[PDB]
RNA sequence: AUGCGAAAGCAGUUGAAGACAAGUGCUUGUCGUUCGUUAAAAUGGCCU
């Protein structure tokens, strides 16, 4: 003997733009929440170590949000002017906020009360303030003073190493993963500089020509840099000192840039960017930086951040908008006498000679139509296929299977008028498509072959035939125009 | 020394049996395993250890064929709808019996079975049958080495227990009788050679809720026959009830009195009688409960008197769930809830 | 071990072993040099086998019982051929034989000489100050079998013709258990529990050497003419001393050592091996009483050896008639489609108030909502003007977007058809200029292919439907 | 009711009808338990054991219309499982071999007979096999070349059978028909399964390409058309089940048969591509997108010819550049890069088109030099280093019309190292042709002038392939697999 | 250089030549039910049932006598119509097989044994009609045979015993029926 | 339903004898019957 073959569904030849697995994951990202802040939102940082928290800047406001309940857990509001950047340390404990009066304030997360250290930088506003990645006692901050100073937070009176040689409005910088001494710095005249700190540091080691004003710089790899500026974005090799790709798939100036790697995904590395139109678009660096997904937020979108690589909770994607709007989008996530009496269940056979297994892998439930076609009740199978709220593919596979077995007229013999009407209703609907049009051609051909006399006798089916005639004529018109357009293409070859 | 010593078990020992000819014990519990031990007095070692998957065990018995004697089987059963049959040196041959031919609405669980012989009586070819409990009065009877469905008997009320007796007839002919006991105490006796037809009914005296019946003193499904000439007729029939009372009948008067008075009514135990086991000869009756510790008593027959010096108060019996007498060497094997069988040797035999 | 007393034959082809079975001992002979379910059961549940021996033309074995009897058991028929009895009720503590004379030590020191080919008791026998005894061997002086050796922690050389001791060697602390004549001048002796073997020389009465094993000794066997010795040690092992009687050198260590380890890491104990001229015969217990064997070359294996046997520890039940899983070898695999990619063969791949500026913006970008609004614009003059004002690469990407939207939403193929109509009207120059028009306008070609192929069955269905409609309308 | 049997005591009855189910009746309670999907109908059934351990039965495989192909079965009766299955090779031929009768049933359909139809069909089949010189019996048979396993494509199924151990190893259903969910009885017997026609392997061995057609039911609106489907299957070298990886519905548009499949050589894409040729002129080249995981078009050549010819062939050079597409009367030489005519800049009379006197049944190239063509009457061996025919051979009395247009390719095949082998079959006539046949086997060299070896076999030979250790396997009408070897 | 041999075989040689359906099967499970024996179209396969494996195979082309019985290439009229398991000559010498061919030929072969070039051959006289079936209880043997004078056949039932001489198989006319249609 | 043919189609085919049943020597039907041609039924459906 053998087993019963389950009925195969009807998979038509695939139409273009099917749903890709990257689209599956980035559409699982759902459950939008909108939070109206006071003013614009500049920068959004995630805690690295236990990634369960993320800071968001505002006007004179830093807010620590939580990944578990998406509510604001803490507020740093001891600022006297507009705060620019709130970035956590690479170690978790201590976050730094660069203000616009000209000073940075570095104090521990989960304690707004204790200002731990206040570094007075240049009197121009300091936009970007980062901590180092490899080392954890060296902070680096830029300003509108067009210099980036490397402070050592033990000796917070003097910049341990100043860094000049730029031209205008340094606003982005990035350390590089493998080299713990090499700092890339994105200015505002383009011209991404690369400094080596164990050298003099007054001059860059070498420059890179991103001809538009670069808006952000991220070391995506130990050997690669990604540059966000102007309309396009451009990814550079480091050692060979050459651009590698240039993706100009945006409309206005791209603004923010984020990169995540080796996480629970069909896509290994995700490079996402945010571009002042609501458009946040997500690329992958393995298929040469092609777009895989994109959301649209209404206002001009400033900052974006995807949850870090070791989140292990519900992952988040945060986008902050110049209308004052934070948008969070989150992928979610008896007695002892009796047991002593019967304590042999969980054993699983660890120390025995011969282990035998026989029990069956239980199949999924058969639907009612499949039970009826397996038990040869053809008319009940047809009615149970034409119960109302089923799937189009399922009603198609019932009719396909029943026609393939041959029980068309056998299924249609005993039908009275009120039972013809459900078949004719779905027939009247499914005349519009293509595959359903072929199968409805077969089945209404045999219905008109059978029931002409009761068609004359009862008036309801007469009106149904009127609707069917109108819709089939309309479909002939559609296919005539389509054949004409195909002829036009064959001319235009 | 405990037969379960060299390779312990992880649940209660639900079924002990000695192989009818070779020195071998077989134990089975809810650990879904089957362990066969070569038994000495000194070192009782593990011959083989099979482990089924997802199927417990409540009843495992040996069964050697009668006309063939070079055909051994091990029948295992738990509360599922199949019954495994291990055939008898590197990998087992385990058939399973899973289909009742038509009569499937009676038993939803194969767990209460007994194994007996039967003679075709047109051809004189004996074969093994498998008796199963059932729904209300149903006892189903399946031909073993083919899994076929032979015959069914229906007693009324609830079956609580059943048993198998033989009767020799002449040179080369016996006939087998099935005894089945209701929960009220009404006893039916069918014969299986001609089809299920009630030979007789009677009633046990007292017996308010009767939970086990056993026949003993001749050949039976525990101390079994090895050739057709060696089949005897049983003498004692013991009926143990839920209250602790064990009535005890002589068959040579019961079959003639047709609503008999017991030879005895033992009342030493006080909880539900969950095991009865006669000696291979029929001189000792071992009655043992399951609901409380240290609840086994041996009885000398025909005196119908409980032995007084064993077990003593320091005998390691546990909650006795399995008892198996040995056919030849005079051993007794007791298995408890902790999973430790324990041997004794009677020095008379 | 469940193997109480075992002994090989001469020439090492069959071992006898007596083992207990439901408190009744059975003896059984198994062949080794390449099952046998024959046995002999001792009917009484009290008499045990106390000593064992093989005897040569019909092969037989000799079983000195507990009772006071010496059975003579043939092998071919499981039958005690003849049961000698010492005229007493004691335990035969030892049996031995050379040629036809048979000699047994009783439990009460009484030597008995029997004759086999006469089936008779020749002489009862006892001497002085041999008061506790448990081992006897007989020296091979030829066919004159005089001057036998006895022992119980003090080996004594006793002559028969005068019934007195001649030499007496110092034995052990524990009683002796092995006493074997090695050469015509030397013999080895090993007690019960000592790891030591004393190689004595007879006539001098001295200790030539001692050989020290690694654990307590259990069984000894030696080669032909004093070349090698196999030792079954109490832990389960085998220790060959190569050339023991050669050139402090008072004590000698074991040259070659053999163990047996299975695949699962467990340690299988050896009992009762047998050595010969470059052929070592090792035995163990596979199942609880069934003896398995092996032959191996001890002059070629290294000094330390672990025999690797394949013991079924945690076998997966590979049934011969079932598959690897589920079905049998006679069924037929079903046709399961699965997640196969179903495509056609017409899928070409791998081979004035306008809105033209917002359209060209959306298509430099890729905006579903913006393109949807521009397509929700309807007026045909505006459509003609926008495509008249557009750019050709923008037109190509517009054609692709329109065709994929048509193929999904086939309800939307009126207005999108007039859109693609005007596009193909206007921008046809760049379209005839681009080489691979199929690979560019793939989805458009496929969608029109499906619909144009759908047409004729629709014509047929409308023909029959109109026939039936006019039939019921005419009357 | 086709088979009946009793048990030994006489209480169970075994019933063996058409619907593939073996039914055990308890006679007393009139009850039944039955085994429902038995790989064919039960011609015969009985019990064996002295207790009734085994049920032994004989199955028909009634779908095989060209030849009755039995299957013996021995069932363990406790488990109701198959303790033994006995079979040989199950080829499907093109016509009914000598005096085969279909089983009897309630109607007369295209798998069985009525009673009167049985008698008349017996006599008519014998008379037609005597009279008509149309007759051919040519079976498709493929070979797995990394395991050397014969694949007999049954209708809607594949019997994987090896020749060394001489036993079946697998049976797979390669079509979404009505193959097993039912035992066909009367008008289900009027219906039929979709038929596998072509089956090929890549030279790598790890891809199977199956072309099948499917017929609609009769007396319906859409009964005129067919649907032709291509399928691509994978497996790893340790299993015995092919996974469907790519299903291509309707190659070359609607209702267009693909009358030749050719795999690719190694050098082009590591032998991971195939060529499909219609009866119109179209050639498509499918290959394996490996950044995807699928098969797709990668080079087309689709002309619109208003003439349909049933007999095409094609061949491929070892470098992967030259493709010889032989349509009826005309061989075209194409470059693979362009799929167009290889027009010589030198023009040394190496013309891109050859016109041959008869319709082409076979094109082959034994090396990169010699092209063999088997034409509808004759055989012509040509060189390609000089565009002129080397050798000729007349086959018009031998193959007049005794083969359909397109089966001489499976008749005659070539070793890729030494030579090719011819196959000629004539039936022994007495005074009118009789039943028995006679097939001669001739082996030529690369030049085809000298015959390497001549042999003769008695029974008709239906297929010759070459075993990849330089020998030749041949099937026979009575399925006796033989070899011509070194 | 080039040799043409025959390496593998097919069809299982049913009992269709009767077309009266006596018993369509002729395979016979052995005495101790461990070996199954099927007569193929060109060989006799002996499968083993505990491991589903063809153990011994008895081809027709190797020994010359079978090549003279079945391998007459002008007509395949002779076919195996019965297989009996014992020895018809001597009582219980095991591993022997007697085979009854359609036209009076009876051969004693030895499965599970090296095939020597002396299988015990016997020819049955009086077989101007064709043999149909051969069966036996203990000792006594009977033969159904097909003869003719409405396109039907007569079934003659003969009684077969042995040993008036060595070659002689004693045949007696038990009974006869005239126009059979089915027979089981 | 045979031959040629492409997935279309193009040509051609349904003859006698015998026997039996039923109805009235005559009508139909039937065939486990011959020769000549390229020639729907028994309320009964797939295991665990």
Query: Of D31, D57, D36, whose CA–CA distance to D45 is shortest?
Result: D57
**C149 Cβ neighbours under 8 A, 6+ residues apart:** C136, C137, C138, C139, C155, C156, C157, C158, C179, C181, C187
Query: Helix C392-408 vs helix C368-376: angle between axes, to the nearest 10 degrees?
Result: 90
Distance of CA C118 to the CA centre of its chain: 52
For residues C217 and C213, give the distance between their C-alpha atoms in angstroms, rounded to a whole number.
Answer: 7
For D51, residues 6+ apart whose C-beta sits below 8 A from its C-beta are B125, B127, B143, B145, B146
Q: What order of strands is seen across the sheet that includes strand D195-201?
A: C341-343, D243-249, D227-234, D207-214, D195-201
Phi-psi region of C64 (alpha: psi -120 to 50; beta: other; left: phi over 0): beta
Question: Strand, helix or coil at D286?
Answer: strand
Q: Flag whether residue B169 sits within 8 Å of chain A, measured between CB atoms.
A: no
CB contact at 8 A, D127 and D148: no
DSSP letter at A220 equals -
Q: How far apart are CA D207 and CA D295, in angstroms?
A: 11
Taking the alpha carbons at both ends of chain A, their separation in whole angstroms is 57
Nearest to C95 by CA among C68, C62, C124: C62
Q: At what angle do helices C368-376 and C415-426 cross, to 10 degrees?
A: 90
Instruction: Give distance CA A60 / C1' F10 (Å).
Output: 93
Instruction: Examine chains E and A and say if they touch (3+ CB pairs below 8 A).
Output: no
DSSP assignment of B106-122: S-S---SEEEEEEE-SS
d(CA A373, CA A367): 10
Strand order in the sheet with E35-39: E35-39, E43-48, E53-59
Taking the C-alpha atoms of residue B112 and residue A203, their distance in angstroms, rounded to an integer, is: 92
Nucleotide nearest to D307 (CA to C1'): F6
- Distance from the Cα of A285 to chain D's closest Cα (Å) equals 15
Q: D4 vs chain E: nearest CA distance in angstroms?
A: 10
Give E67-78 as a 3 state SS string.
HHHCCCCCCCCC
CB-based contact B106:B137 (threshold 8 Å) = no
Cis peptide leading into residue E183 (ω within 30°): no
Q: What is the DSSP annotation of A363-391?
A: PPPPPHHHHHHHTT-HHHHHHHHSSTT--
Contact C438, C348 (CB under 8 A): yes
Residue C432 CA to F10 C1' — how many Å? Answer: 44
Separation in Å, CA D445 to CA C473, D377, D416, D422, E2? 78, 21, 11, 11, 13
Give the torsion through C-alpha atoms of C131, C137, C142, C146, to 10 deg: 10
Q: After which residues is chain C broken (C to N over 2.5 A)?
A: 34, 56, 247, 351
- The neighbour count for residue E178, using CB atoms within 10 Å, is 12
Deposited resolution, Å: 3.8
Among C158, C157, C183, which Cα is nearest to C170's?
Answer: C157
Nearest-angstrom CA–CA distance, B343 and B330: 10
- Give the max Cα distance, chain A: 102
Q: Which residues of A116-150 are buried (b: 16+ CB within 10 A; e: fewer)?
A: ebebebbebbbbbbbbbbeeeebbbbbbbbbbbbb
Q: Tell me how far apart the alpha carbons of residues C81 and C63 are, in angstroms, rounded to a whole number.
A: 11
Which is it for strands D330-335 and D353-355: parallel, antiparallel or unpaired? antiparallel
d(CA D334, CA A464): 57
Chains that touch C (3 or more CB pairs under 8 A): A, B, D, E
C467 touches chain D (CB under 8 A): no
Q: At what angle do helices C442-474 and C392-408 cross, to 10 degrees?
A: 40
DSSP H helical segments within C310-441, as ranges? 356-364, 368-376, 380-389, 392-408, 415-426, 428-433, 437-440
Task: Tally C-beta pairs within 8 A across B and D.
Answer: 46
For residues B284 and B346, what is the distance between their CA atoms, to the nearest angstrom? Answer: 11
In angstroms, the first-to-last Cα distance of chain D is: 52
Residues from chain E that touch D452, judged by Cβ atoms under 8 A, are 1-2
Q: Is C372 exposed, middle or buried (0-12, 13-18, 19+ CB in 10 A)?
A: exposed
Distances (CA, A) of B146 to A291, D7, D37, E71: 66, 12, 21, 42
B98 CA, F42 C1': separation in Å?
35
Environment class of C119 (CB within 10 Å of its CB; exposed 0-12, middle 13-18, buried 19+):
exposed
Peptide bond connecting B302 to the previous residue in cis, omega within 30 degrees of 0 = yes
Nearest to D400 by CA among D188, D182, D136, D186: D136
Yes or no: say if C324 and C317 are a contact pair by the CB < 8 Å rule. Answer: no
Which residues 6+ apart lie within 8 Å of D127 measured at CB? none
With left for phi above 0 and alpha for psi between -120 and 50, is residue C421 left, alpha or beta? Answer: alpha
Beta-ladder partners of C182: none
Element (H, E) at C188: strand C186-191
**Contact D361/D378 with Cβ under 8 angstroms?**
no
Please tell me if residue D330 touches chain C, with a CB cutoff of 8 Å.
Answer: no
Which residue is closest to E32 within chain D, CA to CA?
Answer: D49
Chain B residues close to D49, C-beta within 8 Å: 146
Mutate to test the interface with A, among B7, B37, B52, B84 (most CBs of A within 10 A): B52
Spatial distance between the Cα atoms of D260 and D276, rounded to a whole number of angstroms = 6
Closest CA to E48 of E37, E59, E61, E39: E37
Count of beta carbons in the 10 Å neighbourhood of residue A11: 16
In terms of C-beta density within 10 A (0-12 exposed, 13-18 middle, 19 or more buried), how is residue A258 classed? buried
What is the Cα A455 distance to its own chain's centre? 55
DSSP string, A434-471: SHHHHHHHHHHHHHHHH-HHHHHH-SHHHHHHHHHHHH
3-state secondary structure of A405: helix
Nearest CA among A218, A307, A208 for reference residue A254? A218
Could you count the other beta carbons within 10 Å of the beta carbon of residue D65?
16
Give nearest nucleotide to D401 (CA–C1').
Answer: F4
Residues of B in contact with D31 (CB under 8 A): 101-103
- Distance, CA of A264 to CA of D452 (rounded, Å): 66
Q: Residue D259: which of D346, D189, D349, D326 has the closest Cα?
A: D326
Distance from the D313 Cα atom to the nearest Cα atom in chain E, whole angstroms: 29
Strand F nucleotides in reach of protein CB atoms, 7 A cut-off: 2-9, 31-34, 37-41, 45-48
Q: Is E126 left (phi over 0), alpha (psi -120 to 50) or beta?
A: left
At B345, which helix (H) or strand (E)?
A: strand B342-345
Helical pair A378-385 and A417-430, crossing angle rounded to 10 deg: 50
Q: Which residues contact C84 (CB under 8 A, 6 or more apart)?
A: C69, C70, C71, C72, C102, C114, C119, C121
Sheet arrangement for strand D157-162: D142-144, D149-154, D157-162, D167-172
Closest CA to D234 of D223, D247, D243: D243
CA atoms of A430 and B216, how far apart (whole Å)? 77
CA–CA distance, D263 with E77 (Å, rounded to integer): 44
Q: For residues B35 and B56, is the Cβ–Cβ distance under 8 A?
A: no
User: Cα–Cα–Cα angle for C42, C46, C47, nearest 5°?
Assistant: 55
Q: How many residues does chain A have?
A: 493
- PDB experimental method: cryo-EM
Q: Is A235 helix (H, G, I), strand (E, B) or coil?
A: strand
E53 to chain C: nearest residue by CA? C320
Can you spell out the DSSP letters for C223-288?
Answer: -SSSS-EEEEETTS-EEEPSSTT---TTEE--SEEEEEEETTS-BPPB---EEETTEEEEEEESSS
What one-character-per-residue DSSP string does A294-319 give? Answer: EEE-SS-EEEEEE--TT--SSEEEEE
**C-beta neighbour count of B108 within 10 angstroms:** 12
Residues counted in chain B: 349
How many CB pairs (< 8 A) connect A and C? 162
HSE of C62, CA atoms in CB hemisphere, 13 A: 21
Q: Can you give the distance from the CA of residue D274 to the C1' of nucleotide F2 in angstroms?
A: 38
| DSSP bridge partners of A257 | A273
Q: What are residue E169's phi and psi, to 5 degrees? A: -110, 115
- Give the Cα separation of C324 and D345 in Å (integer): 62
Give the three-class secondary structure for C196.
strand
Cβ-based neighbour number of residue D243 at 10 Å:
13
Separation of CA C297 and C1' F2 in angstroms? 81
> In sequence order, which residues have a C-beta less than 8 Å from that of residue C206 and are 6 or more positions away?
C200
Strands A301-306 and C80-85: unpaired
The residue of B95, B96, B102 whose CB has the most chain D CBs within 10 angstroms, and thus the best one to mutate to test that interface, is: B102
Q: Supply φ then ψ for residue C316, to 5 degrees.
A: -90, 135
> Which residue's C-alpha is at the least distance from the C1' of F46?
D36
- Do residues C208 and C201 lie in contact, with contact meaning Cβ atoms separated by under 8 Å? yes
């Amino acid at each position: 003997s053998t087993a019963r073959p389950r009925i195969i569904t009807s998979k038509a030849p695939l139409l273009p733009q099917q749903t890709t697995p990257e689209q599956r994951y980035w559409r699982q990202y759902t459950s939008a929440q909108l939070v109206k802040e006071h003013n614009s939102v500049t920068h959004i940082s995630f805690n690295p170590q236990h990634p369960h928290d993320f800071a968001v800047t505002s006007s004179t406001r830093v807010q620590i949000f939580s990944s578990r309940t998406r509510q604001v857990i803490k507020t740093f509001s001891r600022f006297k002017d507009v705060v620019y950047s709130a970035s956590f340390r690479s170690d978790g404990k201590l976050l730094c906020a660069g203000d616009a009066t000209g000073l940075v304030s570095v104090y521990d997360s989960y304690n707004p009360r204790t200002i731990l250290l206040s570094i007075n930088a240049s009197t121009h506003p300091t936009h970007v303030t980062k901590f180092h990645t490899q080392d954890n006692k060296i902070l680096a901050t830029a300003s509108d003073d067009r210099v980036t100073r490397l402070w050592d937070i033990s000796n917070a009176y003097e910049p341990q190493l100043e860094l000049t040689g730029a031209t205008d409005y340094v606003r982005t910088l990035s350390f590089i993963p493998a080299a713990p001494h090499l700092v890339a710095t994105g200015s505002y005249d383009g011209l991404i500089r690369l400094y080596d700190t164990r050298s003099s540091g007054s001059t860059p080691i070498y420059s890179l020509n991103h001809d538009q004003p670069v808006e952000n710089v991220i070391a995506v790899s130990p050997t690669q840099i990604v540059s966000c500026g102007g309309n396009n974005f451009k990814v550079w090799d480091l050692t060979s000192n050459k651009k590698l790709y240039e993706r100009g798939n945006f409309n206005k100036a791209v603004t923010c840039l984020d990169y995540v790697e080796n996480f629970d995904s069909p896509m290994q590395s995700a490079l996402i960017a945010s571009s002042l139109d609501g458009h946040v678009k997500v690329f992958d660096p393995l298929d040469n930086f092609q777009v895989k997904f994109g959301w649209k937020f209404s206002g001009p979108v400033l900052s974006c951040a995807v949850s870090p690589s070791t989140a292990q909770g519900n992952r988040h994607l945060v986008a902050g908008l110049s209308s004052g709007l934070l948008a969070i989008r989150t992928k979610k996530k008896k007695s002892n006498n009796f047991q002593r009496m019967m304590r042999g269940s969980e054993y699983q056979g660890d120390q025995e000679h011969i282990i035998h297994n026989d029990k069956v892998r239980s199949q999924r439930r058969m639907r009612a139509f499949e039970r009826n076609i397996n038990q040869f009740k053809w008319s009940e199978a047809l009615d149970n296929a034409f119960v109302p709220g089923m799937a189009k593919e399922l009603t198609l596979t019932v009719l396909q299977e029943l026609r393939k077995r041959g029980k068309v007229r056998v299924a249609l013999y005993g039908r009275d008028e009120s039972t013809l009407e459900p078949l004719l209703n779905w027939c009247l609907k499914g005349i519009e498509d293509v595959r359903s049009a072929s199968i409805v051609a077969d089945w209404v051909a045999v219905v008109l072959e059978l029931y002409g006399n009761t068609l004359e006798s009862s008036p309801v089916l007469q009106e149904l035939m009127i609707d069917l005639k109108t819709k089939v004529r309309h479909e002939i018109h559609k296919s005539k125009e389509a054949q004409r357009i195909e002829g036009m293409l064959q001319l235009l070859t | 020394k405990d037969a379960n010593a060299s390779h312990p078990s992880h649940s209660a020992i639900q079924s002990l049996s000695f192989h009818p000819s070779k020195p071998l014990l077989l134990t089975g519990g809810y650990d879904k395993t089957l362990r066969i031990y070569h038994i000495d007095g000194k070192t009782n070692h593990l011959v083989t250890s099979l482990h089924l998957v997802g199927s417990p065990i409540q009843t495992c018995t040996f069964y050697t064929s009668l006309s063939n004697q070079n055909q051994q089987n091990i029948f295992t059963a738990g509360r599922r709808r199949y019954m495994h049959s291990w055939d008898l040196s590197q990998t087992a041959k385990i058939e399973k019996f899973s289909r009742l031919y038509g009569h499937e609405s009676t038993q939803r669980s194969f767990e209460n079975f007994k194994v007996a012989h039967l003679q075709n009586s047109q051809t004189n070819s004996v074969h093994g049958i498998v008796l199963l409990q059932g729904n209300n009065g149903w006892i189903n009877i399946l031909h073993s080495t083919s899994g076929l469905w032979l015959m069914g008997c229906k007693i009324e009320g609830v079956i609580t227990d059943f048993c198998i007796d033989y009767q020799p007839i002449s040179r080369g002919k016996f006939r087998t009788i099935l005894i089945a006991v209701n929960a009220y105490g009404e006893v039916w006796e069918f014969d299986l050679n001609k089809n299920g037809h009630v030979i007789r009914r009677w009633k046990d005296q007292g017996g308010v809720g009767i939970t086990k019946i056993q026949v003993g003193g001749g050949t039976t499904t525990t101390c079994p026959a090895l050739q057709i000439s060696k089949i005897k007729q049983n003498r004692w029939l013991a009926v143990g009830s839920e209250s602790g009372f064990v009535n005890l009948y002589d068959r040579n008067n019961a079959m003639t009195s047709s609503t008999p008075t017991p030879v005895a009514a033992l009342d030493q135990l006080t909880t539900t009688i969950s095991n009865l086991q006669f000696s291979p000869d029929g001189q000792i009756l071992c009655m043992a409960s399951r609901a409380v510790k240290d609840a086994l008593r041996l009885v000398h027959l025909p005196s119908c008197s409980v032995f007084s010096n064993w077990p003593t108060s320091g005998t390691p019996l546990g909650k006795v769930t399995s008892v198996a007498f040995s056919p030849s060497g005079g051993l007794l094997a007791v298995g408890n809830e902790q999973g430790k069988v324990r041997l004794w040797k009677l020095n008379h035999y | 071990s469940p193997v109480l007393q075992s002994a090989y034959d001469p020439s090492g082809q069959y071992l006898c072993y007596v083992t207990v079975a439901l408190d009744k001992q059975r003896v059984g002979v198994q062949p080794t040099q390449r099952w046998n379910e024959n046995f002999l059961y001792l009917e009484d549940s009290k008499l045990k086998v106390t000593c064992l021996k093989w005897v040569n033309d019909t092969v037989a074995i000799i079983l000195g019982m507990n009772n006071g009897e010496i059975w003579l058991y043939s092998v071919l028929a499981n039958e005690v051929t003849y049961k000698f009895t010492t005229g007493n009720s004691y335990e035969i503590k030892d049996i031995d034989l050379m040629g036809n004379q048979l000699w047994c030590i009783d439990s009460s020191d009484a030597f008995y000489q029997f004759d086999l080919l006469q089936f008779k008791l020749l002489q009862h026998f006892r001497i002085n100050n041999c008061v506790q005894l448990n081992k006897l061997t007989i020296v091979p002086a030829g066919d004159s079998v005089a001057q036998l050796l006895v022992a119980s922690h003090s080996i004594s050389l006793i002559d028969i013709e005068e019934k007195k001791v001649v030499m007496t060697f110092p034995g052990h602390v524990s009683p002796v258990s092995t006493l074997q004549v090695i050469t015509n001048e030397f013999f080895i002796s090993g007690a019960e529990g000592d790891r030591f073997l004393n190689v004595y020389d007879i006539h001098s009465g001295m200790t030539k050497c001692v050989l020290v094993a690694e654990s307590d000794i259990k069984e000894l066997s030696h080669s032909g003419q004093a070349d090698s010795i196999a030792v079954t040690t109490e832990d389960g092992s085998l220790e060959i001393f190569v050339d023991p009687l050669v050139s402090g050198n008072k004590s000698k260590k074991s040259s070659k050592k053999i163990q047996i380890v299975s695949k699962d890491g467990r340690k299988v104990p050896i009992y009762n091996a047998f050595i010969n001229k470059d052929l070592l015969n090792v035995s163990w217990l596979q199942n609880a009483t069934m003896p398995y064997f092996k032959n191996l070359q001890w002059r070629e294996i290294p000094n330390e050896y672990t025999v690797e046997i394949s013991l079924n520890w945690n076998n997966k039940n590979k049934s011969a008639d079932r598959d690897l899983h589920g079905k049998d070898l006679a069924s037929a695999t079903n046709y399961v489609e699965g997640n196969a990619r179903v495509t056609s063969g017409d899928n070409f791949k791998h081979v004035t108030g306008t809105v033209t500026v917002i359209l060209s913006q959306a298509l430099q970008s890729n905006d579903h909502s913006l393109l949807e609004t521009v397509l929700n614009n309807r007026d045909e003059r505006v459509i003609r003007d926008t495509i008249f004002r557009l750019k050709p690469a923008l037109a190509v990407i517009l054609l692709e977007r329109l065709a994929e939207r048509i193929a999904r939403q086939t309800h939307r193929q009126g207005p999108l058809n007039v859109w693609v109509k005007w596009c193909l009207i206007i921008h046809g120059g760049y379209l005839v200029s681009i080489p691979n028009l199929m690979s560019t306008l793939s989805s458009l070609h496929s969608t029109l292919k499906r619909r144009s192929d759908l047409l004729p069955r629709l014509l047929a269905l409308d023909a029959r439907l109109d026939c039936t409609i006019n039939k019921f309308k005419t009357l | 009711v086709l088979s009946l049997s009793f048990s030994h005591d006489g209480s169970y009855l075994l019933s063996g009808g058409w619907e593939k189910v073996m039914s055990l009746w308890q006679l007393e309670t009139n009850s039944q338990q039955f085994l429902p999907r038995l790989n064919g109908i039960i011609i015969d059934c009985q019990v064996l054991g002295p207790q009734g351990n085994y049920y032994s039965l004989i199955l028909q495989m009634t779908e095989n219309n060209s030849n009755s192909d039995y299957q013996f079965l021995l069932l363990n009766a406790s488990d109701l499982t198959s303790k033994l299955s006995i079979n040989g090779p199950l080829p499907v031929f093109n016509s009914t071999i000598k005096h085969i009768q279909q089983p009897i049933s309630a109607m007369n359909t295209k798998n069985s007979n009525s009673i009167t139809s049985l008698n008349h069909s017996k006599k008519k089949q014998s008379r037609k096999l005597i009279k008509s010189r149309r007759q051919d019996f040519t079976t498709n048979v493929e070979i797995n070349p990394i395991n050397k396993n014969l694949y007999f494509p049954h209708i809607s199924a594949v019997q994987i059978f090896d020749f060394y151990k001489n036993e079946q190893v697998n049976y797979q259903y390669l079509t979404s028909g009505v193959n097993n969910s039912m035992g066909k009885v009367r008008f289900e017997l009027n219906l039929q399964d979709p038929i596998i026609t072509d089956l090929k392997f890549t030279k790598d061995g790890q891809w199977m390409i199956t072309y099948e057609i499917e017929y609609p039911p009769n007396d319906l609106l859409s009964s005129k058309d067919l649907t032709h489907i291509l399928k691509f299957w994978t497996k790893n070298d340790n299993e015995t089940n092919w996974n469907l990886k790519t299903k291509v519905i309707n190659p070359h548009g609607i209702s267009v048969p693909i009358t030749k499949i050719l795999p690719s050589p190694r050098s082009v894409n590591n032998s991971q591509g195939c060529l499909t040729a219609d009866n119109n002129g179209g050639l498509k080249f499918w290959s394996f997108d490996s950044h995807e995981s699928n098969w797709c078009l990668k080079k087309i050549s689709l002309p619109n010819f208003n003439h349909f010819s049933n007999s095409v062939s094609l061949a491929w050079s070892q470098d992967g550049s030259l493709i010889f597409h032989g349509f009826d009367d005309k061989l075209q030489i194409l470059d693979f890069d362009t799929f167009k005519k290889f027009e010589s800049l030198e023009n040394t009379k190496t013309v891109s088109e050859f016109t041959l006197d008869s319709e082409i049944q076979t094109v082959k190239l034994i090396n990169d030099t010699n092209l063999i063509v088997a034409t509808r009457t004759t055989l012509n061996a040509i060189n390609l280093l000089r565009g002129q025919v080397i050798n000729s051979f007349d086959l018009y009395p031998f193959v007049n019309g005794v083969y359909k247009n397109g089966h001489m390719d499976r008749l005659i095949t070539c070793d890729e190292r030494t030579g090719n082998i011819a196959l000629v079959i004539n039936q022994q006539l007495t005074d009118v042709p009789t039943i028995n046949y006679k097939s001669r086997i001739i082996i030529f060299d690369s030049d085809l002038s000298t015959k390497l070896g001549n042999f003769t076999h008695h029974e008709y030979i239906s297929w010759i392939g070459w075993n990849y250790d330089t020998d030749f396997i041949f099937l026979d009408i009575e399925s006796t697999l033989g070899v011509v070897g070194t | 250089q080039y040799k043409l041999s025959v390496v593998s075989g097919g069809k299982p040689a049913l009992n269709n030549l009767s077309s009266v359906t006596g018993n369509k099967n002729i395979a016979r499970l052995s005495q101790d039910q461990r070996n199954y024996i099927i007569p193929f179209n060109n060989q006799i396969k002996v499968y083993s049932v505990e491991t589903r494996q063809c153990v011994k195979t008895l081809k027709f082309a190797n020994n010359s006598l079978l090549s003279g019985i079945f391998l007459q290439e002008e007509e395949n009229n002779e076919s195996i119509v019965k297989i009996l398991l014992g020895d018809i000559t001597v009582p219980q010498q095991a591993h022997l097989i007697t085979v009854f061919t359609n036209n009076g030929h009876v051969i004693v072969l030895n499965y599970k044994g090296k095939l020597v070039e002396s299988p015990k051959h016997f020819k049955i006289s009086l077989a101007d009609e064709k043999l149909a079936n051969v069966f036996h209880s203990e000792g006594n043997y009977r033969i159904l045979t097909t003869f003719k004078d409405n396109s039907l056949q007569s079934y003659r039932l003969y009684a077969l015993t042995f040993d008036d001489a060595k070659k002689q198989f004693e045949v007696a006319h038990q009974a006869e029926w005239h126009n059979v249609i089915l027979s089981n």
